Design an enzyme around this catalytic site. Structure first.
Site, PDB file in Angstrom:
ATOM      1  N   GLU A  53       7.147 -11.649  -0.538  1.00  0.00           N
ATOM      2  CA  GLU A  53       7.760 -11.117  -1.751  1.00  0.00           C
ATOM      3  C   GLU A  53       9.140 -11.740  -2.005  1.00  0.00           C
ATOM      4  O   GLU A  53       9.448 -12.159  -3.123  1.00  0.00           O
ATOM      5  CB  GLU A  53       7.882  -9.591  -1.675  1.00  0.00           C
ATOM      6  CG  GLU A  53       6.553  -8.822  -1.773  1.00  0.00           C
ATOM      7  CD  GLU A  53       5.894  -8.905  -3.143  1.00  0.00           C
ATOM      8  OE1 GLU A  53       6.484  -9.487  -4.077  1.00  0.00           O
ATOM      9  OE2 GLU A  53       4.766  -8.385  -3.283  1.00  0.00           O
ATOM     10  N   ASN A  86       9.215 -10.206 -14.703  1.00  0.00           N
ATOM     11  CA  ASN A  86       7.797 -10.221 -15.001  1.00  0.00           C
ATOM     12  C   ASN A  86       7.524 -10.451 -16.479  1.00  0.00           C
ATOM     13  O   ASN A  86       8.402 -10.280 -17.322  1.00  0.00           O
ATOM     14  CB  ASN A  86       7.165  -8.915 -14.554  1.00  0.00           C
ATOM     15  CG  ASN A  86       7.399  -8.651 -13.097  1.00  0.00           C
ATOM     16  OD1 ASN A  86       7.095  -9.491 -12.256  1.00  0.00           O
ATOM     17  ND2 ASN A  86       7.966  -7.497 -12.786  1.00  0.00           N
ATOM     18  N   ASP A 115       6.056  -8.846 -18.638  1.00  0.00           N
ATOM     19  CA  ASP A 115       6.161  -7.684 -19.515  1.00  0.00           C
ATOM     20  C   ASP A 115       7.604  -7.219 -19.749  1.00  0.00           C
ATOM     21  O   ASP A 115       7.840  -6.262 -20.486  1.00  0.00           O
ATOM     22  CB  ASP A 115       5.350  -6.532 -18.939  1.00  0.00           C
ATOM     23  CG  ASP A 115       5.729  -6.231 -17.516  1.00  0.00           C
ATOM     24  OD1 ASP A 115       5.206  -6.918 -16.618  1.00  0.00           O
ATOM     25  OD2 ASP A 115       6.561  -5.328 -17.302  1.00  0.00           O
ATOM     26  N   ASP A 124      11.413  -7.274 -10.746  1.00  0.00           N
ATOM     27  CA  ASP A 124      11.186  -6.920  -9.348  1.00  0.00           C
ATOM     28  C   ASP A 124      12.480  -7.086  -8.579  1.00  0.00           C
ATOM     29  O   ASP A 124      13.134  -8.119  -8.713  1.00  0.00           O
ATOM     30  CB  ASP A 124      10.121  -7.821  -8.712  1.00  0.00           C
ATOM     31  CG  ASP A 124       8.722  -7.579  -9.256  1.00  0.00           C
ATOM     32  OD1 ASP A 124       8.455  -6.509  -9.829  1.00  0.00           O
ATOM     33  OD2 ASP A 124       7.864  -8.463  -9.064  1.00  0.00           O
ATOM     34  N   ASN A 177       9.404  -2.828  -8.421  1.00  0.00           N
ATOM     35  CA  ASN A 177       9.311  -3.037  -9.870  1.00  0.00           C
ATOM     36  C   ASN A 177      10.021  -1.958 -10.702  1.00  0.00           C
ATOM     37  O   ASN A 177       9.910  -0.763 -10.421  1.00  0.00           O
ATOM     38  CB  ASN A 177       7.822  -3.107 -10.257  1.00  0.00           C
ATOM     39  CG  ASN A 177       7.583  -3.726 -11.624  1.00  0.00           C
ATOM     40  OD1 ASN A 177       8.403  -3.611 -12.528  1.00  0.00           O
ATOM     41  ND2 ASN A 177       6.428  -4.369 -11.784  1.00  0.00           N
ATOM     42  N   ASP A 199       1.267   6.243  -2.653  1.00  0.00           N
ATOM     43  CA  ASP A 199       1.014   6.550  -4.076  1.00  0.00           C
ATOM     44  C   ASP A 199      -0.462   6.756  -4.391  1.00  0.00           C
ATOM     45  O   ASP A 199      -0.828   7.676  -5.130  1.00  0.00           O
ATOM     46  CB  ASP A 199       1.551   5.436  -5.015  1.00  0.00           C
ATOM     47  CG  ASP A 199       0.691   4.137  -4.998  1.00  0.00           C
ATOM     48  OD1 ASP A 199       0.528   3.484  -3.940  1.00  0.00           O
ATOM     49  OD2 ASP A 199       0.203   3.742  -6.086  1.00  0.00           O
TER      50      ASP A 199
END
Ligand SMILES: [Cl-]
Ligand SMILES: [Cl-]
Length: 129
Positions: free
Chosen positions: A35, A46, A48, A52, A59, A101
């Site tokens: 990462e 990113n 969109d 990050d 994110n 999650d």
């Protein structure tokens, strides 16, 4: 800060990530390697508009606030900038929420694509833990 491999393994260990939700320490070190290349200051934008942040590339679409990701959430209730510290506490605390999650460590694209199903134990070989 750019962590050494064993330096980061030891930091993640004392923060309780070894076998957290069943994920061995090598998985967390492998994830961080691919990462951020172990750099706490790593950031990437990113497609969109989210960004990050940090050692585990957490994110802003979901997990932290940076004030420039419209309509996003802040599920770890922290400014994204806090995830860039030389001290990995904030990233680890947030990572623990993320991995609990639903999709587990699949939430980290680099983990899914480069760590999952491989021999991650090598990432902690030789380390004082
Ligand atoms: Cl160390
Ligand atoms: Cl907003």
């Amino acid at each position: 800060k750019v962590f050494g491999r064993c330096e980061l393994a030891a930091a993640m260990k004392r923060h309780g990530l070894d076998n957290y939700r069943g994920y061995s320490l090598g998985n967390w070190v492998c994830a961080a390697k691919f990462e951020s290349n172990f750099n706490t200051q790593a950031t990437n934008r990113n497609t969109d508009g989210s960004t990050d942040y940090g050692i585990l590339q957490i994110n802003s679409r979901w997990w932290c606030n940076d004030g420039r990701t419209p309509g996003s959430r802040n599920l770890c209730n922290i400014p994204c900038s806090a995830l860039l510290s030389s001290d990995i506490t904030a990233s680890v605390n947030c990572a623990k929420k993320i991995v609990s999650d639903g999709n587990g460590m699949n939430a980290w694209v680099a983990w899914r694509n480069r760590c999952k199903g491989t021999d991650v134990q090598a990432w902690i070989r030789g380390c004082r833990l």
